[PDB]
Design an enzyme around this catalytic site. Structure first.
Site, PDB file in Angstrom:
ATOM      1  N   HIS A  33      13.129  45.630  17.620  1.00 56.13           N
ATOM      2  CA  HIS A  33      13.090  44.353  17.980  1.00 56.13           C
ATOM      3  C   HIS A  33      14.312  43.432  17.966  1.00 56.13           C
ATOM      4  O   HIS A  33      14.357  42.489  18.479  1.00 56.13           O
ATOM      5  CB  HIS A  33      11.454  43.544  17.634  1.00 56.13           C
ATOM      6  CG  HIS A  33      11.597  43.224  16.092  1.00 56.13           C
ATOM      7  ND1 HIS A  33      11.012  43.841  15.147  1.00 56.13           N
ATOM      8  CD2 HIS A  33      12.171  42.231  15.534  1.00 56.13           C
ATOM      9  CE1 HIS A  33      11.218  43.486  13.817  1.00 56.13           C
ATOM     10  NE2 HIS A  33      11.974  42.349  14.294  1.00 56.13           N
ATOM     11  N   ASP A  63       9.693  50.908  16.663  1.00 59.77           N
ATOM     12  CA  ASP A  63      10.366  49.819  16.337  1.00 59.77           C
ATOM     13  C   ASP A  63      11.704  50.123  15.478  1.00 59.77           C
ATOM     14  O   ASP A  63      11.716  49.887  14.250  1.00 59.77           O
ATOM     15  CB  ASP A  63       9.527  48.797  15.395  1.00 59.77           C
ATOM     16  CG  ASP A  63      10.282  47.339  15.454  1.00 59.77           C
ATOM     17  OD1 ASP A  63      11.619  47.319  15.773  1.00 59.77           O
ATOM     18  OD2 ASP A  63       9.659  46.475  14.960  1.00 59.77           O
ATOM     19  N   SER A 156       9.419  46.132   9.991  1.00 55.37           N
ATOM     20  CA  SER A 156       9.022  45.635  11.181  1.00 55.37           C
ATOM     21  C   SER A 156       8.497  44.369  11.282  1.00 55.37           C
ATOM     22  O   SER A 156       8.972  43.369  11.956  1.00 55.37           O
ATOM     23  CB  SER A 156       8.191  46.605  12.061  1.00 55.37           C
ATOM     24  OG  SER A 156       7.621  46.096  13.235  1.00 55.37           O
TER      25      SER A 156
END
Lengths: 185, 51
Positions: A33, A63, A156
């Protein structure tokens, strides 16, 4: 620069996960991300020291992301802060782990569950996550989760905070190493 | 920033700060919006960036 140190994109700040390599090519892993929509990465908020460019990004669903180093002189330590990292391993329930991030520093805890599904909303769902009782706060994304000299995961997200306590989810690092054909050192 | 899609059980941990009306710098939009919900709609956005 090493695991847990700050990294800046054009959008914001995350943390370096682990320094890895393939042959003589050096990269660093971080959260997907963070790499999503990011091209260049810098070592400082003033964006004067370049680190490299994004080479891969996988988010949501997974992720993780990887950045290829373009800075030839910056030291690329195979550690997390001072902690040497020598191998990667799979998380197990009850495992004692430690996370280092650019906002909160170093915090410890344990793995409480495996294969968790985290719904960040808007269709941003990630699967196969490691659940822990370690806290994390904005800026800590992508930082390493390790256990002694073993690399375990990449930060994450989650809930709560370091003051009141929280729950943080991590992307298993083994999956990232395999996808990119890289290794810790 | 719109918080209608909140609250959310989890937030990613990237840093892109927002300044709330409580003078607290919120680390990202997800953290800010969850706080707005937790305040029952009393907290508002002061400006983007750190307070």
């Amino acid at each position: 620069i090493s695991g847990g140190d700050a990294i800046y994109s054009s959008t914001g700040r995350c943390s370096l996960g682990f320094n890895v390599r393939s042959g003589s090519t050096y990269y660093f892993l971080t959260a997907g991300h963070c790499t999503d929509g990011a091209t260049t990465w810098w070592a400082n908020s003033a964006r004067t020291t370049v680190l490299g460019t994004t080479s891969g990004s996988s988010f949501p669903n997974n992720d993780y992301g990887i950045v290829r180093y373009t800075n030839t002189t910056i030291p690329k330590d195979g550690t997390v802060g001072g902690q040497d990292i020598t191998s990667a391993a799979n998380a197990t329930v009850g495992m004692a782990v430690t996370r280092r991030g650019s906002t909160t520093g170093t915090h410890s805890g344990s793995v409480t569950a495996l294969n968790a599904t985290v719904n960040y909303g808007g269709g941003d769902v990630v699967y196969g996550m490691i659940r822990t009782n370690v806290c994390a706060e904005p800026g800590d994304s992508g930082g390493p989760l390790y256990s002694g000299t073993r690399a375990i995961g990449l930060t994450s997200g989650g809930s709560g905070n370091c003051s009141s306590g929280g729950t943080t989810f991590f992307q298993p690092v083994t999956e990232a190493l395999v996808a990119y054909g890289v290794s810790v050192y | 920033v719109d918080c209608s899609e909140y609250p959310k059980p989890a937030c990613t941990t990237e840093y892109r700060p927002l300044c709330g009306s409580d003078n607290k710098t919120y680390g990202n939009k997800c953290n800010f919006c969850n706080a707005v919900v937790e305040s029952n709609g009393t907290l508002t956005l002061s400006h983007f960036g750190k307070c």
